């Protein structure tokens, strides 16, 4: 494809037909052979288009197809929920796998399981069992608070309480992402790199960042998923996965990022009082949550940074902010991140 | 090409010997001419779909895929040579370093 | 959307118009209050409306009258001759002329490659148009044989079989094949016999056909207005 | 994706219609309709080339660059 | 199972065979599709042919049309005459010979050991087809008597007791005798008397035998087709 254009085809039509006869001299606007001409050439300018789009894409798939290097689908949320006993067990009761949970909280009435049995032994207070969200996609990133119910009817069960919000919840991946991790498989054909070793820890798709720290004859692999922690199992399943690319010899050690928690408080004062309710300080946490756990590994937190986007929401509405418990910017090491803990606001 | 063949067939498809100047002659040859150069350029389309033989925009855009990007008047056969060296990059010893050297 | 658009006459009055197209003269007052007119409604010259050129009218000004208007159901004795030639012509439709040479294809008329385009004589395109498009697109539905063109198996004739015997069988064979294909033609009424003989080799036959009247094609294209296609897909 | 036959007759038509009111008749058999057809017929043609083209592109192009027939 | 083989024609389209065949174009994709074809589908001539044997076709070319063809509900005005003959052949049954020696068996109509057996000078046992095998089996029913042939009580006649006196009464019996014999013959469609005549001693009479039309015959083997037998167990 030349990418041909309407003006150039419709000229060496009607030059081709005043040259192959001299009677034919009438061109202008509204005659029948130049709109003939006008629509062979316009659906021939249609072809080459579509063709050339046509030709992007297949390359497109022909890159898919070649090293079956599928596009991620969207993921399911999934946490933790910490559950409470009236007093310490005698029985070492079973929870087997399916086991629902579900939330009174109708803003968000998801409903998650368990995918594996937990014993809780005798003389425990508390047990903590990851959970999955029955749903896929965004909507299984509820925030801290929300699950309150366990649907076992266990009468052994004091209250039930997810200690921070989700976040593992995602849609379908982006374009850019595909074609970044695309890019890091090509870098990583050479095993024994640094970057290698990156995308072997990455290769699992529940990995979010790695940070690779590297010593004499050392290698650590900090990892973490969206919410900041590192499973026994993801542990094992990126370990396995760096079997393959991890150089020969050299010692390799997995172990999880250092997170830290960050309680939020805010005074907010507002401008039109009429607009105090439920939903502006749910709106305003939402915020922040957002803020917070969008901060990737080595990333600050910087206070004006968050008044800023705080105040962004509506400059006019939101007179004043100030913050019952942050006084000074956190650094994070690059072995560390923040994620949100436990968001609370005060309309006034 | 088959413009002629699945043309209307009372149609003529020749120049009449009576007028040498035949208008119909001229209009089915031009639209003949744009059936041919299309179709011709469509045939050489195939080209462009593959690594090989790729030119310029579409050897850009394969290069961009994976992740090697043309350099000042870098022509296409160095530059499809150099992207299919990157894939090929031997690494953890001392021969690729040399070689990188 | 249409509207009645009405000319204001020598001394006339909006209870006059009211009475004419409302069939009564109590809409004079909404005619007033469309309009946007003053009190002297309709003056008697320009010297009157350049005191008050936007709220007053003049003779020979324009007012609208707001009756849904529709150009069917409108009586054809009013339609001026013209027109009806105009739009008996937009209904048998404009076609490009490439039946020009009578004689050429009408000597070889079972053979390909016997008909062209030809130009006006002003440089442009040749094009026939009412009766002569109806010629055109009979000729060559006849000369046509049945499935030889593409995307269109049951247009043609089987005319080309029929170089039979000379006995009034193959006779009535012609007659039949010939007044189904003019019969196929959606704009073609009727076509029936006239007179027929047979000279030895040579076989002769005319034939009469009636075309869609003047009050059905003005009645079709003045129905097409609702959708403004103007345009034949039959 | 890409066009076919009967959508690009509809927009030839609509197209010549839009150019010029000097022409009316689309019916079947018509000198007009029969040229925009065959135009129409050789894009489609043309369409499917591209398609094949582009299939044996996206299960060969790429591999065929490392010498493996 | 069958299907249609078309011949690739001279300037021929994959859209032409598809409106001729599907009776639409838009079954081509399908027709190439099943052939296995690549884009130049039909080239001039074997010089193109060479570059891709296996995935192009030339003129003179088979292509393989899927659609489920069936002998049967075929018009037999396309059936060629020597085609007709043959199918007829088939349909009334080839049989051995012994009606040779007309004039002997007619000598010694009413005795045994009148027929045999006989050569067709190849070297081969002689054969009688259609007409022959029909006027063959004929002969040999009416000369049976009825009930003495094994396994088979009705077939034959009772003209042997026939010999009666020369009256018009004893003629009808006769009539009726040979009219039940030919009616026997399931291919026989109807048999009627002509004329008949006593000269004393000697009963004279002949008769008019109609058997099934071309036309039937055809339909029957044609269906036949589908059992693949092509044979007579009447």
């Given at each position: 494809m030349k990418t041909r254009k309407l003006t150039n085809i419709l000229s060496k039509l009607i030059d081709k037909t005043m040259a192959g006869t001299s009677k034919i001299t009438d061109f202008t606007p509204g005659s029948a052979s130049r709109s003939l001409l006008e629509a062979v050439s316009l659906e021939i300018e249609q072809f080459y288009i579509l063709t050339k789009e046509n030709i992007d894409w297949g390359i497109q798939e022909g890159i898919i197809e070649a090293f079956d290097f599928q596009k991620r689908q969207s993921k399911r949320a999934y946490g933790d929920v910490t559950i409470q006993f009236y007093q310490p067990l005698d029985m070492r009761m079973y929870i087997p796998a399916g086991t629902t949970f579900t939330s009174t909280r109708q803003e968000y009435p998801q409903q998650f399981e368990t995918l594996v049995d937990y014993y809780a032994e005798p003389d425990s207070t508390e047990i903590v069992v990851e959970v999955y969200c029955k749903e896929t996609g965004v909507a299984g990133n509820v925030p801290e608070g929300t699950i309150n119910t366990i649907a076992s009817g266990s009468s052994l069960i004091r209250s039930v309480n997810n200690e921070y919000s989700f976040n593992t919840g995602t849609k379908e991946e982006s374009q850019e992402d595909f074609k970044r991790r695309f890019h890091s498989f090509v870098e990583s054909?050479?095993?024994?790199?640094n970057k290698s070793v990156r995308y072997g820890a990455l290769?699992?798709?529940?990995?979010?960042g790695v940070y690779v720290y590297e010593e004499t004859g050392h290698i650590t692999v900090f990892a973490h998923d969206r919410n900041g922690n590192l499973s026994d199992t993801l542990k094992e399943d990126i370990i396995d996965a760096l079997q393959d690319y991890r150089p020969s010899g050299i010692m390799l050690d997995v172990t999880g990022v250092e997170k830290e928690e960050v309680n939020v408080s805010a005074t907010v004062t507002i401008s039109n009082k009429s607009r105090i309710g439920d939903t502006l300080q749910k709106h305003i946490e939402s915020v922040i949550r957002s803020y917070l756990n969008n901060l990737k590994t080595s990333d600050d937190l910087i206070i004006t940074d968050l008044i800023q986007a705080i105040m962004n929401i509506d400059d006019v509405l939101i007179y004043d902010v100030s913050f019952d418990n942050l006084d000074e910017n956190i650094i994070v090491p690059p072995q560390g991140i923040i994620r949100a803990g436990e968001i609370k606001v005060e309309l006034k | 090409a088959n413009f002629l063949k699945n043309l209307h067939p009372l149609l003529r498809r020749d120049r009449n010997k009576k007028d040498n100047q035949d208008p119909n002659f001229a209009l089915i040859d031009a639209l003949n001419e744009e059936m041919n150069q299309v179709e011709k350029d469509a045939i050489e389309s195939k080209l462009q779909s593959s690594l090989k033989t790729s030119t310029s925009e579409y050897l850009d855009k394969f290069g961009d895929w994976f992740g090697v990007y043309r350099k000042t008047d870098e022509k296409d056969d160095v530059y499809r040579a150099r992207i299919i060296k990157y894939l090929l990059l031997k690494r953890g010893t001392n021969n690729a370093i040399i070689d990188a050297i | 959307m249409r509207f009645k658009k009405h000319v204001v006459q020598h001394e006339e009055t909006m209870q006059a118009i009211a009475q004419r197209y409302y069939g009564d003269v109590s809409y004079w007052i909404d005619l007033v209050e469309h309009n946007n007119?003053?009190?002297?409604?309709?003056?008697?010259?320009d010297e009157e409306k350049m005191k008050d050129p936007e709220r007053l009218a003049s003779t020979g000004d324009t007012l609208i009258i707001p009756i849904e208007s529709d150009l069917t159901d409108v009586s054809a004795k009013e339609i001026n001759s013209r027109d009806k030639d105009v739009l008996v012509e937009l209904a048998l439709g404009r076609d490009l002329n490439i039946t020009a040479d009578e004689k050429y294809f009408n000597e070889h008329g079972t053979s390909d490659n016997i008909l062209a385009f030809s130009t006006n004589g002003n440089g442009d395109l040749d094009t026939v148009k009412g009766i002569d498009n109806m010629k055109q697109q009979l000729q060559a539905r006849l000369l046509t044989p049945r499935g030889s063109l593409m995307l269109h198996?049951?247009?043609?004739?089987?005319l080309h079989n029929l170089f039979g015997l000379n006995i009034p069988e193959q006779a009535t064979l012609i007659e039949m094949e010939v007044l189904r294909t003019l019969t196929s033609d959606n704009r073609v009424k009727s076509a029936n016999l006239i007179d027929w003989k047979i000279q030895g080799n040579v076989y002769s036959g005319q034939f009469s056909v009636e075309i869609k009247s003047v009050e059905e094609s003005i009645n079709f294209v003045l129905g097409q207005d609702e959708e403004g296609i103007f345009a034949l897909f039959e």
């Open positions: 054909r050479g095993r024994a790199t290769q699992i798709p529940d990995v979010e | - | 007119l003053k009190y002297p409604y309709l003056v008697e010259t198996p049951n247009y043609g004739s089987d």
